[PDB]
Amino acid sequence: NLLRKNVDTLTPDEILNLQVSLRAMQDDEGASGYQAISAYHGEPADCKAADGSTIVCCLHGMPTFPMWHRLYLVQFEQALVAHGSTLGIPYWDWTKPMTQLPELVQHPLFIDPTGKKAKKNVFYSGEIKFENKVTARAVDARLYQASQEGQKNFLLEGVLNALEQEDFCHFEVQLEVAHNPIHYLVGGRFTHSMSSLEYTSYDPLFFLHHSNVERHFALWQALQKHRGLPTRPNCGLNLFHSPMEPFGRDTNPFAITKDNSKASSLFDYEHLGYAFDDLSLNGMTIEELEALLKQRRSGARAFANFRLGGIKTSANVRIKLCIPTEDKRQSDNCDNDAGQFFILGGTNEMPWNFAFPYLHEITDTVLSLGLALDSNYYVTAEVTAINGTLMPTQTIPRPIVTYIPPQGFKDVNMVNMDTSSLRFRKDISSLTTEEEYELRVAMERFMSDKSINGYQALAEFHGLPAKCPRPDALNRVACCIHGMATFPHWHRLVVMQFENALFTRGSPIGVPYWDWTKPFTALPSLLADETYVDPYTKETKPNPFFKAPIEFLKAGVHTSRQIDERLFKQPSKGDHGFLYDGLSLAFEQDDFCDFEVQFEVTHNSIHAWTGGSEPYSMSSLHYTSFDPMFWLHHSQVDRLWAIWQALQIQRGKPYKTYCANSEVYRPMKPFAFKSPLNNDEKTREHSVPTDVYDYQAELAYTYDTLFFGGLSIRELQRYVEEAKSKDRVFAGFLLMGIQTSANVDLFVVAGGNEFFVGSIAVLGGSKEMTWRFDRVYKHEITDALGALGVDMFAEYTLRVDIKDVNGTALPPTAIPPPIVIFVPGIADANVKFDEQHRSRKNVDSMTVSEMNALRTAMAAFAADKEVTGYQQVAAFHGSTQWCPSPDAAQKYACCHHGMATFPHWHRLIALNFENGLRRNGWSGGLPYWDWTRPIDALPALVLEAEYTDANGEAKPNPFFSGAIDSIGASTSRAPTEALYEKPDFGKYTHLANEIISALEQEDFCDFEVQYEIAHNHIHALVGGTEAVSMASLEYSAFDPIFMLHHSNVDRIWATWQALQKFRGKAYNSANCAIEILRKPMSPFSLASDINPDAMTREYSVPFDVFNYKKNFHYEYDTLELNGLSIXQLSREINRRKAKNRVXVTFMLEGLKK
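^ that's the sequence the OP posted. Answer follows.
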């Protein structure tokens, strides 16, 4: 152990030793010499990086800064000791308030106690041999403080704030930033001083300083040891596996550093042959320090968020805190300054950008001015070059305020239920042909023709007629928000504009969305078809969604989305789909901005993907909004946010943009404009996105489903926990906003060969608004590494190749090099309530994997012949003597009909089937199929006799008719009647009508008659000539289709209830036909022995089966009917009820036939 002590605590003998020894190495021309070694850091630039010209050898701004410099300390230290030097390089604690530079360097000509004479002095200055002469340091007044409170110790504040962060990445950015002030302040206006990274190493005070920053590093890693956090760098692993020059170079004097030139070996410093005396700043126990820090965390905080990079110079950035001006006059209170920091840099600097935002805490001064941390204010930056020259604000991306609420805090609630109408945005596939035609007409009229209130204006809002900040004057950019936390607010508003525009032109629907998350083979016919036929005129006219003119240019310019490439099925990636993967990762996060980066750049992919190389396509930020697809596209984008937001409310965590709070108060670019530039009241009202968060309250719309994948929001929650419990590794991109729009391809390179892990797109344009992300974009590289047979920490690099959408070559330098991130996962929740929840969807929307998973379970269900097993519950339709026993004689078939209690009993049946099916290997709820909607063929699940399993397979089926009774010992065959679709353009042929009629009446029984007799239709429709089918209820239940039927049947019974809730009448109870409503069911109530289900055992009485929500714990995909929402439904039945009509009545008695 070489010893590194405090500089002030040195003994005159220790000091004499240091002096004579550093003098000794000062007269060394050899590689152990001061010149040769100081030449490692700074000018002359001997290293070469990327494909660049000669560039400074030292490494700054990267995660490798601490390793490189701790190793530089080791090299200098051993080079010292090569001339004893009994001690290692001392640290001077500059978090300790200062009056002057350490006395060792205060004055040249140090006196020996044996004087004699003089001098030397080696600590005062080290000669910059080449390019003479030496350089003293012009100190700044800021270095010396603690005098009368303010200025508060900001050096200490820097290292203490860095010491607080629990990631290596964050710690690294805050540490390097906090280490820059000494360089700057000691260096000063002199070019050649510690102030520039060109020559900062030639000054002994540099080594005395980095001794201290190293002590900070060791202190941090030690504080990480206590108690359960990694001391490993989890950032930018690629730069770890290469020799950091000139330490790996063949002429390196000492073997200890050459054998340690790899940054990978420098995570711990025990093998380096040095040690500090104390490494605890300001007389603080590690327990005291961590107490102070973890209790500095608690409460509400506010930070100046800065996005830093190499500016080719050193600079002081002063932080001014601003209070916004209401009026035209620039009266913004920027008087009071909130903070300060420093940046080291130079010419021939290594190009660099922190992958994470630098945060400078301003909470205290924000508290000083008496304005809430939550409220609106902003932060501006005064950049003074080290030259003393005041610098343009453009030099550095503008500061932001980051707000940390008191955890945990629930943001304000949404407005209760629904009333009385909201615009419903559906899946494009969920649209009936009628709806397609009507929003086609709306779009047709809005687009054709042109006005200020017309399509082209709104298409112009987003990009390239460049009206931002104002259409005047000198320099104009696109208005849309990109590379910011406010992107989805902006585009949400935009989609609302589109919505109003289409509603006023006569469309019943909100703007539909298309799930690109669902794997799709081709574009939806809605936006794919060249033309379409008007049902009335039979005239073929343009599909308004295929193309759209670009008016403001005078030529034959139309939208050309012609090229869509790289997506459609393979390569990327895919667990399900590339988009699905990206968005999954997006939905994973708790914090807003973290989610937002993933959100946005995942969405960018579909832009570049569908746009292709076409200049007037979705590829270019300029013209992408002219393409109609946009509008539907971002409907979905909006919906995505919606889902995410819902997640948060289930997570119990805040859903508003607190990560970037100041930016929420900037008025949305083209929306806040007065009446000529924007004529939409609502959107202009929400030109401040603060009220934009509430889903349906302020903006008055909602979606049909919030389901992502096939997952419910809680099912999605379960998924993200499962994914979060695995050890993952990512490749992070700092997307900086290059002028054009581009595609980058990502490669993992092990030994001698590279692997394609994925591709991401950066959306932009020539006249784009300058944009830059605060955080880094993580792309899952884990499965790559898994398929590479290469471990997490094993040696591999990343390659990118960037090419513009137009197809020209882009230098790999255009975007900062991606970095590797390691994330270890863990969760205590669940424990959750996932066992007691179910979601019921269409079998027609199901995925093949879900299909197979469904089949298997049923095979297992049908295998068991008595008690548990499907045959028993289907035999609840099966007439064994359970009708009033033990004295039961001649009667009868036990199945609750009669008919008052039909809905109840069959609810219970479908529930028994469901639980019996989940018991045997399934995690989903019993699905259904919309027979209200017209049907060409049976659902894919039942139509074929044999199906192909994952590895191939003989017919089970088991969801085929072949399901046997074993009582009569034969298969329940299902035929088809020559049916069912004759619907003209309108309206609601067959079942739908009937069902709607049923929904009309207020009374339970009056509803139930129509309801059930409507339900009989299918029993008789899939029930063919063959009596073994569903046509007769002796054998009816045994065909698995039954389950689907009286799933959907039940759903109607649920929808009705919803209506009854909306209508202000009794829903989970009834006052008609009480006698049977009071009697427990025949098969469900018999015993614990007769049926498996415990809940159907407890809930036998019809009164209890009324409330399915709380009791049976299952919700449906939707309660829509033939595309109609419940509110819409009410409007429709009232509309029918308003007309004068005759009706015919039938008195029905039960006959066996």
